[PDB]
From Swiss-Prot:
Comment block on domains: The MIDAS-like motif in the VWFA domain binds divalent metal cations and is required to promote trafficking of the alpha-1 (CACNA1) subunit to the plasma membrane by an integrin-like switch.
SUPFAM superfamilies: vWA-like (SSF53300)
Role this protein plays: The alpha-2/delta subunit of voltage-dependent calcium channels regulates calcium current density and activation/inactivation kinetics of the calcium channel. Plays an important role in excitation-contraction coupling.
Domain Cache, first and last residues per copy: 405-503
Membrane topology: Single-pass type I membrane protein
Protein known as: Voltage-dependent calcium channel subunit alpha-2/delta-1
Compartments in which it is found: Membrane; Cell membrane
Alphabetized Gene3D superfamilies for the sequence: PAS domain (3.30.450.20), von Willebrand factor, type A domain (3.40.50.410)
Gene designation: CACNA2D1
Keywords of this entry: Calcium, Calcium channel, Calcium transport, Cell membrane, Disease variant, Disulfide bond, Epilepsy, Glycoprotein, Intellectual disability, Ion channel, Ion transport, Membrane, Metal-binding, Phosphoprotein, Signal, Transmembrane, Transmembrane helix, Transport, Voltage-gated channel
Tissue: Isoform 1 is expressed in skeletal muscle. Isoform 2 is expressed in the central nervous system. Isoform 2, isoform 4 and isoform 5 are expressed in neuroblastoma cells. Isoform 3, isoform 4 and isoform 5 are expressed in the aorta.
Amino acid sequence: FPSAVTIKSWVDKMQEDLVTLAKTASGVNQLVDIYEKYQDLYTVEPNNARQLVEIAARDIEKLLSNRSKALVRLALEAEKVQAAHQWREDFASNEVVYYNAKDDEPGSQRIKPVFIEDANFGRQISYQHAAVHIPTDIYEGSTIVLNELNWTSALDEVFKKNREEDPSLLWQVFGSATGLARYYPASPWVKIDLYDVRRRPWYIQGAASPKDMLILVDVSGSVSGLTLKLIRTSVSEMLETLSDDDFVNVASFNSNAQDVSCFQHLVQANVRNKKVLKDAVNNITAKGITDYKKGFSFAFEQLLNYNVSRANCNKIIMLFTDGGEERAQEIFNKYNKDKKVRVFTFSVGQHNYDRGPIQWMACENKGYYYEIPSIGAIRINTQEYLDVLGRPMVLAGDKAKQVQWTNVYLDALELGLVITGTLPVFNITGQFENKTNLKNQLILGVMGVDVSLEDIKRLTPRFTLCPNGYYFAIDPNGYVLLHPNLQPKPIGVGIPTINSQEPVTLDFLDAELENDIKVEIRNKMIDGESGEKTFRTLVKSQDERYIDKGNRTYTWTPVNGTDYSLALVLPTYSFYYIKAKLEETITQARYSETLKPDNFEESGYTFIAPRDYCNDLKISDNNTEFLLNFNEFIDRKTPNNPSCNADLINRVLLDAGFTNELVQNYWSKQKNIKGVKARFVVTDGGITRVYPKEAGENWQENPETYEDSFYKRSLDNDNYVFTAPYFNKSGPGAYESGIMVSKAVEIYIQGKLLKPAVVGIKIDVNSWIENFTKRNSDVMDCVILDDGGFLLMANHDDYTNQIGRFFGEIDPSLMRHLVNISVYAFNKSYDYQSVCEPGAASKQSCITEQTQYFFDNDSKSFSGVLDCGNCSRIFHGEKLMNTNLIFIMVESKGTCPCDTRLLIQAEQTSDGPNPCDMVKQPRYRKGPDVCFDNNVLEDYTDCGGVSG
Ligand SMILES: *[C@@H]1O[C@H](CO)[C@@H](O[C@@H]2O[C@H](CO)[C@@H](O[C@@H]3O[C@H](CO)[C@@H](O[C@@H]4O[C@H](CO)[C@@H](O)[C@H](O)[C@H]4NC(C)=O)[C@H](O)[C@H]3NC(C)=O)[C@H](O)[C@H]2NC(C)=O)[C@H](O)[C@H]1NC(C)=O
Ligand SMILES: *[C@@H]1O[C@H](CO)[C@@H](O[C@@H]2O[C@H](CO)[C@@H](O[C@@H]3O[C@H](CO)[C@@H](O)[C@H](O)[C@H]3NC(C)=O)[C@H](O)[C@H]2NC(C)=O)[C@H](O)[C@H]1NC(C)=O
Ligand SMILES: *[C@@H]1O[C@H](CO)[C@@H](O[C@@H]2O[C@H](CO)[C@@H](O)[C@H](O)[C@H]2NC(C)=O)[C@H](O)[C@H]1NC(C)=O
Ligand SMILES: *[C@@H]1O[C@H](CO)[C@@H](O[C@@H]2O[C@H](CO)[C@@H](O)[C@H](O)[C@H]2NC(C)=O)[C@H](O)[C@H]1NC(C)=O
Ligand SMILES: *[C@@H]1O[C@H](CO)[C@@H](O[C@@H]2O[C@H](CO)[C@@H](O)[C@H](O)[C@H]2NC(C)=O)[C@H](O)[C@H]1NC(C)=O
Ligand SMILES: *[C@@H]1O[C@H](CO)[C@@H](O)[C@H](O)[C@H]1NC(C)=O
Ligand SMILES: *[C@@H]1O[C@H](CO)[C@@H](O)[C@H](O)[C@H]1NC(C)=O
Ligand SMILES: [Ca+2]
């Protein structure tokens, strides 16, 4: 091949022939003057990070404090009404009136509501009464249910007062310990219905304090058969009652005690850790001699570790067995002489073995005894231990009445991602005399109010910041409360197979790329500190195909109301923004005609961003429909805009004149420029003005400019960015659409560098290959590629048919050597909110690894020898300056008859990372500071064996 000097000269002409075309046709240099000729039409305003985070954090406190006041109002009225209730035994004479949610009966009258449609909720609701959900295995009309349906009727007059005071109030619910849930407003319930209010995460978190469960499983020979698969089901059903604040481990014993999994100590019991225990429990076999002394010694020695992260709270042992004659009093007299550990015992299956020793362990230690004779008793009996664990919480008094917020989860009544407040309700009947204390140690139920994530996202406006700026808040666990990467889909825990139940818990470090600085930031935010940090990091693009570096200025502050912490990611070139200032109406009238669809023939195809201009307008998925309503809204409404905020209206209208000016003044001068398929401009305001109206059919970008991959990618780079096309019918037209070449504009007003908009062209392939010719050879092939290894041209004209495909998919030998020569670095990450086709053993959820490639260093010239084996291939690569393109000079593939394994850049389904070694060095976290257990006044004289 020609020497380096010849290649550099040859590629310099290509650089000078491609940059010039994009520089001139698009008009980036001439758009700055437009933004600099009309300075007095706007003004620049600062974006100070410190106030922005603290303003939003204070607003989040108020929103989370309004619902706290609504919770204490409901808990107070529920307590004082239950005391006044007089227990009855007949209801035929006095029929209770209520609306049953699950319907299309003597002893209880039903209601027929109006069910008008309403916003906020996505269903038909009725603000006149509260609906009741009764589980399908709980019989309405019983004395327990009917009595609960009576005294839980004064709650409706408190439900309306909360809604009238806070019109933005979402579901207010009362989860009763009987089993029925009463929620407001009334709506019909959402195959077979298996919903139980007592098993929901918001109910379990308010019914007891965090725990340190440790399951003991009897895997001796006597449990083989039916009673072994009941034990396996019961243990799995018990693990569903553990949140991320609880730490669990599963062990087994048959003349020898050992763990069922790879953990060997208490683990955080998140979604991934619980799936490992569920997989290991299903693979146990029943054989050997039972030995309770060695099984319990192992359990007691695992609850006394204190070397790892724990909950430092309720320490319980759940023993799943059948029966026996051994009491093991010496183990209990040695390990817990002061009874710091509760023991819960379960007798699974139908058998003739002694249960006396089993019931004895549950009475000496302050626990309970449960019986599971069939598969139908598994669900009820595996959630009743929370009644015992709540005894020290009730005796606490008003100290236990602390509002708690759950993890982000999906609402049962489909409403999106929500978090729920929580407040337990105590049975305080006969409190004046304080004499009964027999059933007053249990909670009546749990109060709860839902807060949608859209409500929180409204308190953190994002349109004043650049498209690369965003807010995010995290729990004191690392889980993000709000984040741009968080999606309303369940997370995956492995590879699915075919033969709302779990929270959407996504860590902050698993939402974006993980750095050493970000780990230090995450720990500081968890502790509840304030600070800032400016650093360089590589940020993934919108489409998981590119990675680019930039400067960020993470600023975080704590939220005083709760344990959350809020941070704002503000990059450079975003500390100032253009705020439109207007005092007339002729400019608005003049700019209104620019967006008329009938004028698109001469003004270009104009898009529009579906933002919240005001509540009267309706956001739709059809831009033409929503644009049509927008243009006949500025005029049909008075310019003062009593209900529409002028900040957003002035923003789009002002850019409607700037962008149209470029179209008319310059883009209208030339209508045919070589092989330019389309000229476009995307701005911060929200209008996109692709000039050829016919070419607008090929535009397949998001109408909202903030969610455009090329917009964010071009902002960081101070050069031209080439966007590779898609492949395999992912988009319409490979050569019928062109190659996008973005370019961000930059202006200086008063010494402040700003990036309002970007422009670009869509160069045709046919007009591009002819320039590259100066061809179908069988000796060597020359192509160009992009900061990611995607093909844009070809020499053999066989790779031309696959423009926009990863380079490693067609010539892995050279591609793999490029990584080894340090020109194309890469980093991999896991995507947990992904959907994939199932395997074999209906697209389920799974973890898919992602790989992105990028330039390693700033070196321009690359050359070397590729030794594929008994061959000699020598290449030469050169970087096209002012862009992200590189040109290589390598021989043909046919010279060396070597075909190595293909290199793939796509979402490959995986199952990692391995949690076996993740628990060895877990991420930093901070547990709750409250703890309620081992109360002296606790009765604990009511186990399940004394009665029987
Ligand atoms: C909050 O706590 C209070 C008390 O602290 C609690 O009110 C008490 O409710 C029970 C019912 O569960 C009342 O018991 C009365 O006396 C006996 C005992 O149950 C009942 O007679 C039979 O009992 C058996 C149980 O073994 C039952 O199967 C049978 O159906 C009953 N009836 C028969 C055989 O005909 C009485 O029926 C029952 N009711 C009376 C006498 O009116 C206590 O008297 C209640 N205590 C007080 C002080 O009122 C209340 O339920 C708790 N809150 C909630 C939500 O449960
Ligand atoms: C448990 O079951 C019953 C279902 O409605 C309710 O009992 C009814 O309570 C009403 C209000 O207390 C009574 O109406 C008034 O009662 C007062 C008694 O102090 C008197 O003025 C009159 O009896 C009556 N007033 C009128 C008719 O103008 C009902 O009489 C009474 N029904 C029966 C059969 O006793 C309970 O309210 C209900 N509990 C809850 C919490 O809703
Ligand atoms: C959360 O509360 C803390 C105090 O508990 C607030 O800290 C204040 O910070 C300002 C700015 O330096 C000081 O002038 C105040 O004196 C501080 N408060 C106190 C009580 O000393 C913090 O601002 C609060 N966070 C938000 C977002 O409002
Ligand atoms: C952590 O676990 C170890 C092992 O169970 C505890 O015991 C120590 O073990 C190491 C290694 O043999 C040595 O330091 C001593 O033999 C043991 N005692 C001490 C005081 O270290 C250990 O106590 C646990 N806790 C800590 C903080 O190490
Ligand atoms: C992203 O990729 C970079 C480059 O491939 C990696 O960071 C490099 O890691 C090696 C090994 O520790 C260091 O010798 C280099 O100095 C690093 N490059 C830097 C810091 O620019 C790593 O895979 C990713 N970078 C992260 C996670 O920060
Ligand atoms: C509710 O919260 C808002 C701020 O989000 C606050 O201004 C208001 O006072 C609170 N209370 C009511 C009744 O609106
Ligand atoms: C699409 O499937 C694979 C994936 O890229 C590709 O190799 C194949 O050639 C494509 N098939 C068609 C018909 O385009
Ligand atoms: Ca046995």
